[PDB]
Write a protein that binds this ligand. Sequence first.
Ligand SMILES: Cc1cc2nc3c(=O)[nH]c(=O)nc-3n(C[C@H](O)[C@H](O)[C@H](O)COP(=O)(O)O)c2cc1C
Ligand SMILES: Cc1cc2nc3c(=O)[nH]c(=O)nc-3n(C[C@H](O)[C@H](O)[C@H](O)COP(=O)(O)O)c2cc1C
Ligand SMILES: [Fe+3]
Ligand SMILES: [Fe+3]
Ligand SMILES: [Fe+3]
Ligand SMILES: [Fe+3]
Ligand SMILES: [O]
Ligand SMILES: [O]
Lengths: 400, 400
Amino acid sequence: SIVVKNNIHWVGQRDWEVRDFHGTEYKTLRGSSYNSYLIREEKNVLIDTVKHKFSREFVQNLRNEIDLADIDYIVINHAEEDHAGALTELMAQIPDTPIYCTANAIDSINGHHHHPEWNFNVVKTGDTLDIGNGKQLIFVETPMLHWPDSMMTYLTGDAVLFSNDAFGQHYCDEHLFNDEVDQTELFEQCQRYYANILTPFSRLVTPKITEILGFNLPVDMIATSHGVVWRDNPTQIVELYLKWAADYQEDRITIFYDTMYNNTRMMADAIAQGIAETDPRVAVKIFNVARSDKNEILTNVFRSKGVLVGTSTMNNVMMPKIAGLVEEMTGLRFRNKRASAFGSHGWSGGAVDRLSTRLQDAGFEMSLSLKAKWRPDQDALKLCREHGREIARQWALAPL
Amino acid sequence: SIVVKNNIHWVGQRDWEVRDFHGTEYKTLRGSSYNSYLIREEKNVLIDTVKHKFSREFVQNLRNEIDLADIDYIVINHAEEDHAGALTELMAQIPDTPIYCTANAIDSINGHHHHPEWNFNVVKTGDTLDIGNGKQLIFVETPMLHWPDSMMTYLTGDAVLFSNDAFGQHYCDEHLFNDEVDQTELFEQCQRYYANILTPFSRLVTPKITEILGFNLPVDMIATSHGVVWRDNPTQIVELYLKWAADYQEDRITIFYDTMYNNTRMMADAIAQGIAETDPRVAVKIFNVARSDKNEILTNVFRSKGVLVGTSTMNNVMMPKIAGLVEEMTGLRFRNKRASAFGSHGWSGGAVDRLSTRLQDAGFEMSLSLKAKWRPDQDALKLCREHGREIARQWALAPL
Ligand SMILES: Cc1cc2nc3c(=O)[nH]c(=O)nc-3n(C[C@H](O)[C@H](O)[C@H](O)COP(=O)(O)O)c2cc1C
Ligand SMILES: Cc1cc2nc3c(=O)[nH]c(=O)nc-3n(C[C@H](O)[C@H](O)[C@H](O)COP(=O)(O)O)c2cc1C
Ligand SMILES: [Fe+3]
Ligand SMILES: [Fe+3]
Ligand SMILES: [Fe+3]
Ligand SMILES: [Fe+3]
Ligand SMILES: [O]
Ligand SMILES: [O]
């Protein structure tokens, strides 16, 4: 175990191998960690557990740190399998130990573990739990961030905020603190995490953070459930969340597509050239959805002021990977972004109009579409390049 | 080159490495071949070419077989890149050589190659082309099988039908004839080809085959553009096409799903058990779309009387791989099939109803949906197993 601060001990699990989260919809290219914490004052408190995969290691490591019978309280901020997965294994040894969680958490814990006989203690925002030596735990409900059962736990005196998923990231390292790891990799994983997970709940992020700041509680460290512990200027991740929640966008345009014979690809490249020669201020990224990392694309969309999506017509409908990605964007609910559909067809086409409608359903402000027949010749590529010019001028943040 | 029959020579290209067709939407697990044919009578006729990738090999191999200036006519049954890709390379050496094709083919050839100055000869069904020695070519238009430009070429005397894509399959082997290869692998690739490509055009297959048979033309061999040449009982593939075109279905049910925490998976397994214990006549297949071959799933759907599709609710919508697969099935237009949606959710759900609607849009006759909250307990698994019973009884081809 590792000492976080004073009597706070890290008893979590590092995961160097993990590459698949949420089935296969979140790629963790730099692994992850599942942070669990043991506070040892007059009372002994365990905050969260780990993924069920590492349940046998978690309990064994916990035994080496403390006698299981000496654990007074267990706090579950979040009952997702990556934090409450080892709960059944633990409660098998100490079935009488009280569990402090939200009312919604009782539903989610019982939903996964099927042990309603456990001793649950419903907490709400403002409720306190004394652990001795002048210190206490303060609970703050954070529903739909990102689950109905989500909450945070604040420790007085030591001034440590256990925020669980919030402000966390999928980044594995032997070092525990934020000032001990590579800043670029840390930032990338942080923004990747928010873009793919917390984007649809951005409207709830700002008022909740404002509420927490209203409590006037000092924060020396922010102990998340994923990745590093923020100790050096810990509120930097809070400020990033405030910026990211305000319908974040840079002067950036993301282009992604799928293709069978590279006809749509040639259209995408021509559009990009038109943009770059019209507005040098705009950053342009191009991805083939069949050949690229899906979560990297979505992170770029989150950063972009607008997107262009390409697809060829196949059996009167759009390419499936495009349809799948559009469905996902419909759930992430991006705001204040614009979009334009394009692609090639053989005869009757129809997939571009179909795509344009579904992008509109996803919440994008739609511009005119761009269509081409078979492989674009020099004249057709001019039209594609002209489309990029028209898009650049329309989506301009500032004149010229 | 290989002698097909008399003066008919195979001058195509084998592709052992190929794994991706139509972008990445068709996996060729056993490679493929691109069959081109050179007929040498009084006139010399080249039928189709090969993929553009092998253009330099194709021309060089063609030179070794015959002087390029001695080629009288070029026949293009189909202008898709895997058959007409090496055309520009060839016409650069012999620009005056006439091209015989459909009216729609002029649009598709020029669409890919941008050389409208080529000498095109529009042919329609019934048109003939004498090549000497009492032999001639007879052209038969096959629009939307699978392209608007598609046609077949029949050679009199030798009685060889050049059917291009039709009756072909993606199967690579050193041996050229159907009686020289593994029958099981051949059948599998044949059915895989029809299910993923020709299913939406099944209504056109039967009348077209009926029309061809009406011509009373003898067929000794069927030389496709993909895979083996049918010489031993060559009409067996024609009969399979007739069976497959009649809204083909066996006593079979396909179940596929995507999941994040295996909750939906446990539902799928319970449903299967309920079916198998209710109707022993039914064959059941289960696939995880994120972990399985997409084209194998679709081949099973083609063979199935009905399907069950599972998904969890993620950001109020369905899993993207499921959305993508449903979009593709909407294009394949399966007929006379039934479906049932299922899956797990956390709180409000909604993805199952969303999926049920889109399956209905895909043409499936929808039965009642099955829903569960979090991880199904013993009581919930009974309900899932009961759902399988209800489905089995409803979809029964015969009583009991
Ligand atoms: C399997 C298949 C199905 C197709 N279906 C259609 C169609 O329904 N409507 C259409 O206009 N073109 C259709 N096409 C033609 C393509 O849209 C055309 O070749 C396009 O220019 C290729 O786009 P891409 O190279 O960007 O993938 C189809 C092509 C293939 C291979
Ligand atoms: C990222 C994420 C988003 C979710 N969104 C919803 C939702 O919008 N509505 C809902 O009812 N449950 C939601 N859930 C909960 C899951 O539907 C629930 O855990 C389900 O039982 C898991 O299904 P599975 O294991 O088959 O993938 C979400 C879960 C995750 C991880
Ligand atoms: Fe979570
Ligand atoms: Fe988590
Ligand atoms: Fe084809
Ligand atoms: Fe082909
Ligand atoms: O989580
Ligand atoms: O093809």
